Every structure is written in C-alpha cells, then in structure tokens.
C-alpha cells in the first residue's frame, strides 16, 4: 500500500494545466481574467480553491454535467461562426466584467439587445456540415425588474428556444431580484447544445437571448479535471492524486480515492 506523497503534482508525463485563478467553466465562457486560457488543451486540468469569477453574475443549471464533458474533451478550441443577428444591437457589455479599462463581457458570448425601439423575433440557423460534434454554449438573461426588461428587450416577456433535429430547449426568463452580487441583482443562465454531423442548430428568440459566437470542437479521450491545492513540480509520475503524485509500483494505495492515470487501487 502506497501511503505517502511528495505533496507535489509531477508535470510529466501527463499534460497538466494549472488553472490558477480560474475555474474551467470561466475559461470556457471567456471571463476576461481567464482569457489567457483561450484555445488551451490538457490531459489534466487542475482547479484551485482560490479561483474566483469576475464577470457578469451567472449560474449553470446542471453545472456538473457541462464541467464534466468539457473536462473530458480536454480542449477549449473555439471556432467563430458568422451568425447574422438582424435588427438587434450586438456586443453588449458590463462594468461587472471590465476587459482592460472599459466594460466588456464573456468573450465567447454575445449579449443582444434592442435596436431602436424594437427587438424582432430572431430566427437563425447554422448547419453542421462537418464530421465532428459541435458544442454550442448560449444563455438567457434574467432581469431584476420590469423596467429593465423593457428597456433592454422591448417585449414584456422574452423567450429563447434552441433546437436540433431531435432535441429542443425553451427557456422563459424569470424577472425578479436575486441576492446582490458585485452590484447586480440580475443573472445570466448558461445552457448548451450539441449538434451532430448532418444536423442543424436553430435559435429563435424574441428577447433575453445571450447568443453564441461559434462552437467548441468536441473531442473524446483521456482528459479529466481535478480539485487540488498541490504545487506543480518538474518530475515524472504516472499517477496523480489531489494530494500529489504517488508511485504506482504497489498494487494498492491509501492517499486519495480521487486519482488520474495509471494508479494503484484505493483501499
């Protein structure tokens, strides 16, 4: 039984990506202090307890599932697509999410609002003519007041519907206050949609849509994610635990039930 660790994660042979101040989801959406992680790849993504968000306040229903599937994919490769958003204003931003000195927003999302005195029913399509799966991340704004709702979106109640040829999600925004976070009582909710080859994305909304800018390329493989505060050293070990790397010469181990790589069995 391997019962000890050096207390350090070895950076070989597996590709370790240290998240520092960022969670994987913040890296995905493009929180500004996380844009360093754009287009990055990993065998193991390491999330630190000191990570924090610093953009528009948001939640992700089924957070655990999105985080898991991106972590398993092992890449943030993003491909911009030319969505056309007729009759609305694009690139909305916020002082909750400064990028350099000015207001900004998640890099991978596009906050649409009214143009002039109207917000038409948006109805756009994007076919998948490739031979891989595309992951689309999109969102819904929930305003805190009715005044806010109409100022941004004109319609008294919005709706976002995103579908493929065999799946559909319709979200109705919910107006009201949540607890004040960084000055704001409103929220964005994040959703995702996978589109297989030969399929197509349709987005239909008459308000409150936080639009995608493109897609993340999905991969399959050996990638994963781990929560750990262990420093990352230059050394070689096949087996990684949140406690540090451990030797795998023994058949069993008692360091941590969470492991990655060729590891002894936890007892």
């Amino acid at each position, epitope marked *: 039984v391997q019962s000890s660790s050096t207390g350090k994660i070895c950076n070989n042979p597996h590709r370790i990506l240290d998240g520092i101040d960022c969670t994987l989801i913040d890296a995905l959406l493009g929180d500004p202090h996380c844009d360093v992680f754009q287009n990055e790849t990993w065998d193991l993504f390491v999330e630190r307890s000191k990570a924090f968000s610093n953009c528009y306040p948001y939640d992700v229903p089924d957070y655990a599932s999105l985080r898991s599937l991106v972590a398993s994919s092992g890449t943030l490769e993003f491909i911009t697509e030319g969505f056309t958003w007729t009759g609305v204003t694009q690139n909305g931003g916020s*002082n909750a999410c400064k990028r350099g000195p*000015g207001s900004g927003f998640f890099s991978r999302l596009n906050w649409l*609002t009214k143009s002039g005195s109207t917000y038409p029913v948006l109805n756009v399509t994007m076919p998948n003519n490739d031979n891989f799966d595309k992951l689309y991340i999109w969102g819904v704004h929930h*305003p*805190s007041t009715n*005044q806010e709702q*109409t*100022s941004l979106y004109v319609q008294a109640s919005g709706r976002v519907t995103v579908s493929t040829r065999r799946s559909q999600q319709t979200i109705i925004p919910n107006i009201g206050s949540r607890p004040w976070v960084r000055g*704001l009582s409103s929220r964005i909710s994040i959703y995702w949609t996978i589109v297989k080859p030969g399929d197509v994305l349709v987005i239909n909304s008459n308000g409150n849509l936080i639009a995608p800018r493109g897609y993340f390329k999905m991969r399959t493989g050996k990638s994963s994610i781990m929560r750990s505060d262990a420093p990352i050293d230059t050394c070689i070990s096949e087996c990684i635990t949140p406690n540090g790397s451990i030797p795998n010469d023994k058949p069993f181990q008692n360091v941590n039930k969470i492991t990655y790589g060729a590891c002894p069995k936890y007892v």
Partner: antibody, heavy 138, light 108 residues
Framework: QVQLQESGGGLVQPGESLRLSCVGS?????????????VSWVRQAPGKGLEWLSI????????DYADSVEGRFTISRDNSKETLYLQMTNLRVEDTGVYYC??????????????????????????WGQGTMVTVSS | DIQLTQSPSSLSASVGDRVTLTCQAS??????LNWYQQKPGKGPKLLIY???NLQRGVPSRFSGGGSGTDFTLIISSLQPEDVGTYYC?????????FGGGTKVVIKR
C-alpha cells in the same frame, strides 16, 4: 419624455470662468431618465447657426470636444442628480451666445442591468433645453 | 471636419406650395443625417432622423430623402406655422456638424 433645462448663464469678463448646468426631468421608454443617454452641448452665437461643442456618454466616458473649445471646456455629469455640467475657462468674446444641452436618442446604458452599449452612437437630438444666455464682455 | 452646405440660404413661398430644401455633405456620410426646425426665440426640434424617418408627432407634410452626400427635406404643402429656420446635421464622424441653415418665409 425627458425634459431638459439649462441654467448658469450670465455675464462674465474675458478670461474668467463659468459653470453651466442642465437638469433632466421626466422619462422616456422603460421609464428611462437622462442618465440612460449620451448628451451634447451645442451653442448658437447671436444671429448665427448651431455649433456642436462637446459630447459625453451616459456613463461619463467617450468624451470629445470641438477644436474651438478643446483644452478650455470640460464636460461632465452627475447621474445621481440627473445633471450635466459644462465648465468653461479662459472665456473669450466670441464664446458669447445661447448654450443648449441636447439628448441623443439611442439608449446607451441601463445601470440596473449592468448593461452598456459597446459603442457611442451619437444619433439625433430628440430633446433640447430652452437654452441659457452667456455674455462675455468687459 | 465634414462640412454641410444648405440651399437655398433663404426662401419665400406661398401657402400650399411644395418646398424643397437641400443639404450637401463634403464626404459620404451614408444616412447619418438629421433635420431640425427652429422657430425664433425657441430651441430646435427634430423633424427627420437618419435621412428619412419622420419623428413622432411631426406633421406628415414633412418628408426626408437622400443618401451619401445628397439629402433633401420636403414640405408638401407649406403652412404659415412653418416659418422658421431648418438645419441639417451630420453624425457620420466627429466633430458633429450642422448646415448653415435655411430660412423659410411666407408670402401672403
């Protein structure tokens, strides 16, 4: 609709300073008030046409000045009071005229939602004040 | 600076006449052009925004046209209350500029 009213005008000697104010009241779509909008100062010398002087965005940024007053005038705003200011210094005789404050029509920010338009539109002046008379004379 | 030149400088016409005012820009300003009316001793009022849009509450006898460098404000049937000065104004680029104004005068 939002309404504007300038004040602060008066007689001053050349070289002296003067601070104009402009107070917004009422409201437009979505109960928006002046602090949702970009605002400009525009002036009109006696018997002459209109001269744009300066613009400021809803949140206080993206300021610009006409060359004729750049380096002498400073535009600012206090959104808690829905008030705009134009601080004039080193005034000259040819600055004499009526000064109007004027709202641009496009919504530029909604504070309660932490939203801000990416760009300063600076489109049409849909509301003007009644103007305030400034005389620069010895 | 983009210069706007308005013609004519001054115009006299009878009640009921179709009247045409022109604004010429020194460079292509697309449709980023507005027209205002100012009555003596009063502040301007928006008539037309973005070259051709009639502002809410403005009488339908007013219409706007043009693009690029050439624009027109048309009054289909001049009324006595239409006397005053009309300005065009450009916001393609800073600094924002106004035409020198056209004064309208009634014949009776």
């Amino acid at each position: 609709q939002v309404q504007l009213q300038e004040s602060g005008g008066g007689l001053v000697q050349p070289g002296e300073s003067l601070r104009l104010s402009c107070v917004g009241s009422g409201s437009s779509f979505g109960e928006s008030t002046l602090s949702y909008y970009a605002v400009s100062w525009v002036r009109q010398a006696p018997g002459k046409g209109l001269e744009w002087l300066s613009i400021i965005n809803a949140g206080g940024g993206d300021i610009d000045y006409a060359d004729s007053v750049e380096g002498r005038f400073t535009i600012s705003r206090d959104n808690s009071k829905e008030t705009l200011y134009l601080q004039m210094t080193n005034l000259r005789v040819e600055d004499t005229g009526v000064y109007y404050c004027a709202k641009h029509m496009s919504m530029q920010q909604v504070v309660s939602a932490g939203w801000e338009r990416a760009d300063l539109v600076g489109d049409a002046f849909d509301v003007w004040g009644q103007g305030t008379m400034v005389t620069v004379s010895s | 600076d983009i210069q706007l030149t308005q013609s004519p400088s001054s115009l006299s016409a009878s009640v009921g006449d179709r009247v045409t005012l022109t604004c010429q820009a020194s460079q292509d300003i697309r449709k980023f052009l507005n027209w205002y009316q100012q009555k003596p001793g009063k502040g301007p009022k928006l008539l037309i925004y973005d070259a051709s849009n009639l502002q809410r509450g403005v009488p339908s006898r007013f219409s706007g046209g043009g693009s690029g460098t050439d624009f027109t404000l048309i009054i289909s049937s001049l009324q006595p209350e239409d006397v005053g000065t009309y300005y065009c104004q450009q916001y393609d680029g800073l600094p924002f500029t106004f035409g020198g104004g056209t004064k309208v005068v009634i014949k009776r």
